[PDB]
Design a protein around this ligand. Sequence first.
Ligand SMILES: *[C@@H]1O[C@H](CO)[C@@H](O[C@@H]2O[C@H](CO)[C@@H](O)[C@H](O)[C@H]2NC(C)=O)[C@H](O)[C@H]1NC(C)=O
Ligand SMILES: *[C@@H]1O[C@H](CO)[C@@H](O)[C@H](O)[C@H]1NC(C)=O
Ligand SMILES: *[C@@H]1O[C@H](CO)[C@@H](O)[C@H](O)[C@H]1NC(C)=O
Ligand SMILES: *[C@@H]1O[C@H](CO)[C@@H](O)[C@H](O)[C@H]1NC(C)=O
Ligand SMILES: *[C@@H]1O[C@H](CO)[C@@H](O)[C@H](O)[C@H]1NC(C)=O
Ligand SMILES: *[C@@H]1O[C@H](CO)[C@@H](O)[C@H](O)[C@H]1NC(C)=O
Ligand SMILES: *[C@@H]1O[C@H](CO)[C@@H](O)[C@H](O)[C@H]1NC(C)=O
Lengths: 300, 50, 47, 50, 50, 225
Amino acid sequence: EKGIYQTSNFRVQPTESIVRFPNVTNLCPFHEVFNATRFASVYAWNRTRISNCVADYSVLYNFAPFFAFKCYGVSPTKLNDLCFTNVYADSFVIKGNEVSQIAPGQTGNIADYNYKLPDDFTGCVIAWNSNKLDSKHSGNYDYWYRSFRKSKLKPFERDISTEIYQAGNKPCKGKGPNCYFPLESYGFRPTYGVGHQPYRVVVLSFELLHAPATVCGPKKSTNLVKNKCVNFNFNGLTGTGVLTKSNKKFLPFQQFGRDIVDTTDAVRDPQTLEILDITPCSFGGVSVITPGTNTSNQVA
Amino acid sequence: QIAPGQTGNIADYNYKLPDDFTGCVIAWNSNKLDSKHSGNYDYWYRSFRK
Amino acid sequence: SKPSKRSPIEDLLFNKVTLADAGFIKQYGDCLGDIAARCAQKFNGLT
Amino acid sequence: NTLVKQLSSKFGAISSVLNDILSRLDPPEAEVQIDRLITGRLQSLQTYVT
Amino acid sequence: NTLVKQLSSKFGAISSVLNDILSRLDPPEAEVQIDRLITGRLQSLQTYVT
Amino acid sequence: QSYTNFTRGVYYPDKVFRSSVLHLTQDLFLPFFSNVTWFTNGTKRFDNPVLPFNDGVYFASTEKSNIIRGWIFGTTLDSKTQSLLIVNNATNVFIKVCEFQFCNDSWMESESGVYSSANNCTFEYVSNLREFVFKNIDGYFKIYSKHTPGRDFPQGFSALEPLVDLPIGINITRFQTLLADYYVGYLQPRTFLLKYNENGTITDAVDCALDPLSETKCTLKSFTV
Ligand SMILES: *[C@@H]1O[C@H](CO)[C@@H](O[C@@H]2O[C@H](CO)[C@@H](O)[C@H](O)[C@H]2NC(C)=O)[C@H](O)[C@H]1NC(C)=O
Ligand SMILES: *[C@@H]1O[C@H](CO)[C@@H](O)[C@H](O)[C@H]1NC(C)=O
Ligand SMILES: *[C@@H]1O[C@H](CO)[C@@H](O)[C@H](O)[C@H]1NC(C)=O
Ligand SMILES: *[C@@H]1O[C@H](CO)[C@@H](O)[C@H](O)[C@H]1NC(C)=O
Ligand SMILES: *[C@@H]1O[C@H](CO)[C@@H](O)[C@H](O)[C@H]1NC(C)=O
Ligand SMILES: *[C@@H]1O[C@H](CO)[C@@H](O)[C@H](O)[C@H]1NC(C)=O
Ligand SMILES: *[C@@H]1O[C@H](CO)[C@@H](O)[C@H](O)[C@H]1NC(C)=O
């Protein structure tokens, strides 16, 4: 029928794609934790930090097959894009039946007394079966775990106290009148079953919310197009828009900017440190004006 | 690894189900008849892939 | 004598009321300043 | 102002930004996080229109 | 009376009482059950206001 | 000693540039008009105070000689502590971390601490009002500063930019100063309405729980009601 109808929407498509990752250092310090000769006890789990490095996760797939590989907030195969902004890595040895306890929100003697992940946890828990290296025919007693504590642990706390714990009512000193040593050894043996065999667990802990990053990006960068509708990837922030020269007085402190409604409207180029504004590519509704089928097939 | 959403040498290079796959994955232990003391060399996996 | 040929009272009535939506070809504003917020500034699909 | 500001809400998702969900997660997990955002966005739009 | 009555509904949750959900379940499932009760109660308020 | 009265301790809570907005955010801040403890007892001896950490602290020196330069944080302040020794001619420089067994706390002299071994981490970084206003909180000790040149407070508004965010990872139950007119306060969870300028700077703030008015201002997200 004669009239004006709103039928669709125009979008300006990008013509080029860009990636602007920071200068690559070619440092990938991941074999130091995965390929270490000794791992820490779970009661005193080890912690390292990764900064000013570039990661390539194929190396750990080259390192070994794994018993378990569970990521929260991120999936495998997506770690070759920007994957970290602040990097820690925890390392410990645990029992097979307790491997399921290294996960957000779990309870048990390790989740409660030795090592706990926050409920709001982003990262990957990688478990390798280590019987060949950690078990001894007499039992490997270098690994200790805490069995007694007065209260539950909080996320990422490390309780390394060895003070005697009492389960009874009469305050005792020393060991054996209801006073017990808080740690117990586990003698790992080659003859134990899968759930009792030793496992080496590495937990990669990071946050993807912060604007700057000093880690990740095996991807090659491109040249910086400006004043043209393009796709872009700036330190893991992806989108479509027109990039322009900025006159915003960013502090050396600030990395990203946002508009009145808390959506990104500016970035600091990771290689040039120039401030660029982001204007989304033009779009809008499209309406068709027709005299109607019974008059003419011309439209505006 | 024979399940939707899994990764590994088979899920990546030999046999991957759709992530919206429907149907049944049935498996059983064949050691009694399939294995040989000299080794059964009739089975192999691609083990790498671009 | 005035553009739009409004009466003095109409001129006051229009000057007193502040219009936040300001419908026009919003692309004219372009950028070069902090976003006005006029309330999606088109970009979030609200026009 | 309220309808636009609702875009920044998570509604239980890991991130309020759809591109971050698509970048971080593979399809089968992204679909769940996206469905959570879609539900929130429909509630916001239906309330606005009402 | 309808709004108060709706507080006793489960809306698909295992329990209508938040303290029972938090006491009996682990945080991971408890957040889902709470999100279901929040969705139902928020819909009840939106219906009342409309 | 005595207590003072000021509206200080505002800092940029995040790394995101904002301008010409009123931003309502929740973080740990020194509350407005919160009791602040104000501080030559040593002369030639020590007798320095030891303070709690609670959730986090605000500290601001205005001392020509920078007599207080470093700090020790820890669960008990015994032999296994976090000795955050910071000696600075510059704003912040020569940071040290983790435990040392003994401390240095000699007229117009300053002695170094002597320890037998470092059995834990080591970290380093090298760089009339000279107000070293800063904040201490979280798994990383985010130290902020602002220098706005007598030494009495103007009782104005000024925001603090971050200076350093070195990793820490320790309990930090207690706090004490390291010495060779100081203000020390404590942070609490608070929601603030922060006013941003045309430039990337904060010019004012409303403490959303101080009084009924400020709460109304936060409810409306405006400095005018
Ligand atoms: C933000 O900083 C700029 C300088 O980087 C300030 O620019 C001044 O603007 C006034 C008024 O236009 C001029 O008279 C000055 O000469 C400018 N200074 C310089 C160094 O060019 C700007 O005013 C600042 N904005 C605010 C809100 O303080
Ligand atoms: C590192 O991994 C390789 C894998 O072949 C192994 O041979 C080597 O011994 C490992 N390094 C150490 C110190 O064990
Ligand atoms: C623990 O991590 C540190 C990181 O610097 C490393 O030097 C040390 O050898 C590790 N120890 C064990 C037992 O893994
Ligand atoms: C940290 O110190 C507090 C002292 O208030 C203590 O209660 C808590 O158990 C300590 N935690 C660890 C992991 O040392
Ligand atoms: C990256 O390297 C280039 C080499 O030309 C240099 O000009 C640029 O400043 C570097 N950027 C950073 C952030 O190091
Ligand atoms: C369209 O863009 C041209 C660019 O030269 C400008 O002169 C004109 O005023 C613009 N018109 C509108 C309606 O935006
Ligand atoms: C608080 O009281 C002190 C008393 O010396 C005074 O100097 C200060 O100006 C007062 N603050 C305000 C904001 O009135």
